[PDB]
Structure formats: structure tokens, C-alpha cells
């Protein structure tokens, strides 16, 4: 049951346990009990290498969880700039609202992260 094992490893910054699961045909868009994918988890924790190979193996860059939370929101909340840049490069919607009405832009205004704001305007 690979998806599960891959979820649990994208969480844990397991760069290699992830690389291997991929090569065993693990589903990249494995859904967890809350609609969270491996991309969600790796972007949330700032695990850049992992984000990048998940994209390369076809990870849905605009995946919503059952809360309307996207990978982009999660990279934004913890201010992971690099990952934010790469998610945009791969076409994440900057206008996506979670079910609270928040966008990745709103978050950057809320956190006073001036650097993250410019990145979302370009």
C-alpha cells in the first residue's frame, strides 16, 4: 500500500525513501484521510528536493485538500520562498482560496512577509 508509505515519507524529509517509493510505482497523488497529497506535505515542511521530484513524477500542483488548502498555501504560511517560486513556475493558481477565504497572497499580508508578497506579484 504505497501511497500511504509515500505520504508518511514526504512528511518526514525522507529524500531517499521518497525517491525509492517513486521507483516502485507509488501513486504521486496519494490522498490522505483529509485530502492531503505528498506535494502538500513536502511543501509544508520546506523539503525542496522532494517537492521538485514529486512535480517531475506528475504531482497535481493545484491539489485541494478537504479544507481548500493547496500546496501553495502551505509553502506560504511557513514562508518557504524557494518552494513558492517553484510552485508558481509549475502553474499553481495564486488566487486559490481556502474555505476560510484566504489566498497565498492574503497569508503573506497577514504575516508581514514582504519578501513573499513581491514573489506573488511577479
Amino acid at each position: 500500500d504505497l501511497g500511504k508509505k509515500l505520504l508518511e515519507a514526504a512528511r518526514a524529509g525522507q529524500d531517499d525513501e521518497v525517491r525509492i517509493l517513486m521507483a516502485n510505482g507509488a501513486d504521486v497523488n496519494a490522498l490522505d484521510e483529509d485530502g492531503l497529497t505528498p506535494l502538500h506535505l513536502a511543501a509544508q515542511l520546506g523539503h525542496l528536493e522532494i517537492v521538485e521530484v514529486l512535480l517531475k513524477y506528475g504531482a497535481d500542483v493545484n491539489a485541494e485538500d478537504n479544507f481548500g488548502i493547496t500546496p501553495l498555501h502551505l509553502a506560504a504560511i511557513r514562508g518557504h520562498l524557494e518552494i513558492v517560486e517553484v510552485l508558481l513556475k509549475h502553474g499553481a493558481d495564486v488566487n486559490a482560496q481556502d474555505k476560510f477565504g484566504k489566498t497565498a497572497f492574503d497569508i503573506s499580508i497577514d504575516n508581514g512577509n514582504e519578501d513573499l508578497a513581491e514573489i506573488l506579484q511577479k
Binding site: Q44, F67, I69, F100
Partner: protein, 359 residues
């Protein structure tokens, strides 16, 4: 024919410099802090091992503020249930200073680690809770908010002394000024984050600390975090999943209208009764827990009342729960300054520990 003098080494650790001068020796790596490694070392003057954290904050304004705040608060605080600063080491000159080492008491263990291996006796849960609140009384009386209480910031030794540590996320909020909109928005560790923080954005108060103590007590009762949300929305989910949907009164006290709107968007939920969750827990403990894990920060019990609660009657002694004599004031809150200036402020605060300093 040149004095082949051979003094050499800064001590090294995992390839990084750990330069704690001739006074601290026998280093041992003991994990990571926010902006550097921590080592334990033998204090050649006090004849005990201590904990030394290496901090390297000078590149980033917010690392600077957090470092400065921890330093100025803890240097002024003096209380048995709060970690102290014993010494601070850095370069003799502000240009040479890239790192700051903070030296503290070494504590065997902490509650996060204890809970991973141990079902606590009720005597333990009790005495630990007494000490968290006693230290917190003092913190709060100083007009300080800690903003990151959680088991792993509660240090422990084998005589069951408990000390609160990690004040990097702490802050003054002098109540003679209005702070609505001024407070940093994403504070506390998620599972310990009071509902208002994700709801009354930038308008919370020192009662968020109470909510965290609430979560810690629940954790000490079952060795499991009570609200393990995966993100802010899910965190809210986990809280309403147990407190139940907020009342109509409580709801009409949400300041932020977008939050109120969202709360209304949610299916109703039943409160889950405390003893359904904790069938083995002492029912006075469950009463106090109810009081601290109150959705509405205004109805939520306060530190001095929590100490007076029937559960802590064995230890409660107001004459033996000191407050801060000099509470902090609004001017100490103004640390929104360039990283260069913060560096000067850190430089000037740490001077009094430099070798030879007079006064």
C-alpha cells in the same frame, strides 16, 4: 627562528566552531536550537555540566529580534520555574561577533521526552501543573506573553523541578497600550495554538498561554496531544471537534468577520464530555482543564485563579508564588529596527558578561 608558539584550536563540533573559551570544556552535542547547535559542557568554575546554545542571528532581522527578546527577558527574570542565563559569550568587538553563546542550567530531561516513555502518576501531573502555573504567574505579571508553551519547553530534573525555557517566541505587551493589530500573527506551536490566534488575528492576549497549559494538561493525562491538527484549518477542526461548535454568545464575540463567517459555514458539532475522553482522570483535574480549554479567551481562567483551583490545593501558597517586581513596559517592545541596530543592542546587552567588565 620565530617563536614557534603553538596555541591553536577553537574546539570543533560536527565541523562547526564551538568556541566557548577555556571556561567550558568537554563538549557534547545535544541537538538543535532555532539558530544553532546546542552543546553540553563542563563549567570549570561552577564544577557542573551546563547547556550552551550557539546562536547566529545576525543575517535576519527576525532572528535578531527573537534573540534580543530572549536575552532581555531572561536576564531580567528571576524565578525558580524559569530557566536563567548564567553566562553569555561572544567576541570582544562588534565586527568580530558573528555568534553568541548562551549558557544555562543543564536539565536531565523534559516533559515531551518524559511523556514519550511514561504514564505519569497523578501526583506527578499535579506537581508539574502547579509548577507550570507558578512560573507562568510570574511571566504574566511581567507583562510578558510566552507564546510557545509545550511539553518540550518544560525542562525537568530528577527531583521533579520543572523550568520553563525557550523564550525566543516571547514578547512584552504592556496593557497600558492597545495592542490590537500590533501582535505577530502566527505564534505558538500548532497543536498548542489557541483558537483566537487563528480567529482574532493579531488581537490575542496573554491567555493564549493558558490555552497552551490546557493542552499540556490534556497531554499529561493521556500521553497524546489532544488537538493534533495538520494545518490551521484542521487545527480549528480538532478544537471544535471536542469543545463542540461555539455558542451564539461566544460566536458574537469573534472580532473578525471573515472568521465569524467561516465558523457559521461549519456543520454543527456536539461537545465531547471531558470524562468521556479521560475516564481515568481525577475529576478536579477535568474541572480545571475545562476552565483552561475555554473557547472564548474572556471566559478562560487566568493564571492566579488557576493556582487557587481545588486541584492544586496541596501546593497553592500565594505567599510563595512571587511576581515580577519591575514589570516590562511599552518602550521595551519597540524592536522593529534594522538588523544592524539590533546587533548593536545585542552587543550592548551582553557586555556585562565580557571578561573584566566592571560593574
Amino acid at each position: 627562528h620565530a617563536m614557534a608558539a603553538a596555541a591553536a584550536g577553537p574546539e570543533m563540533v560536527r565541523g562547526q566552531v564551538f568556541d566557548v573559551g577555556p571556561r567550558y570544556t568537554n563538549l557534547s552535542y545535544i541537538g538543535e536550537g532555532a539558530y544553532g547547535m546546542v552543546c553540553s559542557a563542563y563549567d570549570n568554575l561552577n564544577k557542573v555540566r551546563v547547556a550552551i546554545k550557539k546562536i547566529s542571528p545576525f543575517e535576519h532581522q527576525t532572528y535578531c529580534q527573537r534573540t534580543l527578546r530572549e536575552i532581555k527577558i531572561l536576564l531580567r527574570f528571576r524565578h525558580e520555574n524559569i530557566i536563567g542565563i548564567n553566562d553569555i559569550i561572544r567576541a570582544p568587538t562588534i565586527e568580530q561577533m558573528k555568534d553568541v553563546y548562551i549558557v544555562q542550567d543543564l536539565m536531565e530531561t523534559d516533559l515531551y521526552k518524559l511523556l514519550k516513555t511514561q504514564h505519569l502518576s497523578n501526583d506527578h501531573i499535579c506537581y508539574f501543573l502547579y509548577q507550570i502555573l507558578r512560573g507562568l504567574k510570574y511571566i504574566h505579571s511581567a507583562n510578558v506573553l510566552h507564546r510557545d508553551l509545550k511539553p518540550s519547553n518544560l525542562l525537568l530534573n530528577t527531583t521533579c523541578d520543572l523550568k520553563i525555557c525557550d523564550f525566543g517566541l516571547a514578547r512584552v505587551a504592556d496593557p497600558d497600550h492597545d495592542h490590537t493589530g500590533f501582535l505577530t500573527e502566527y505564534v505558538a506551536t500548532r497543536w498548542y495554538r489557541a483558537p483566537e490566534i487563528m480567529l482574532n488575528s493579531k488581537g490575542y492576549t496573554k491567555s493564549i498561554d493558558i490555552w497552551s497549559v490546557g493542552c499540556i494538561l490534556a497531554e499529561m493525562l493521556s500521553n497524546r496531544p489532544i488537538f493534533p491538527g495538520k494545518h490551521y484549518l484542521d487545527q480549528l477542526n480538532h478544537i471544535l471537534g471536542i469543545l463542540g461548535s461555539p455558542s451564539q454568545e461566544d460566536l458574537n464575540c469573534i472580532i473578525n468577520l471573515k472568521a465569524r463567517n467561516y465558523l457559521l459555514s461549519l456543520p454543527h458539532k456536539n461537545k465531547v464530555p471531558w470524562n468521556r475522553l479521560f475516564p481515568n482522570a481525577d475529576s478536579k483535574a477535568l474541572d480545571l482543564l475545562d476552565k483552561m480549554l475555554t473557547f472564548n479567551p474572556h471566559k478562560r481562567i487566568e493564571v492566579e485563579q488557576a493556582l487557587a483551583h481545588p486541584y492544586l490545593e496541596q501546593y497553592y501558597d500565594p505567599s510563595d508564588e512571587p511576581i515580577a517586581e519591575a514589570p516590562f513596559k511599552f518602550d521595551m517592545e519597540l524592536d522593529d529596527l534594522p538588523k544592524e541596530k539590533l546587533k548593536e543592542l545585542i552587543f550592548e546587552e551582553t557586555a556585562r558578561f565580557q571578561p573584566g567588565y566592571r560593574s
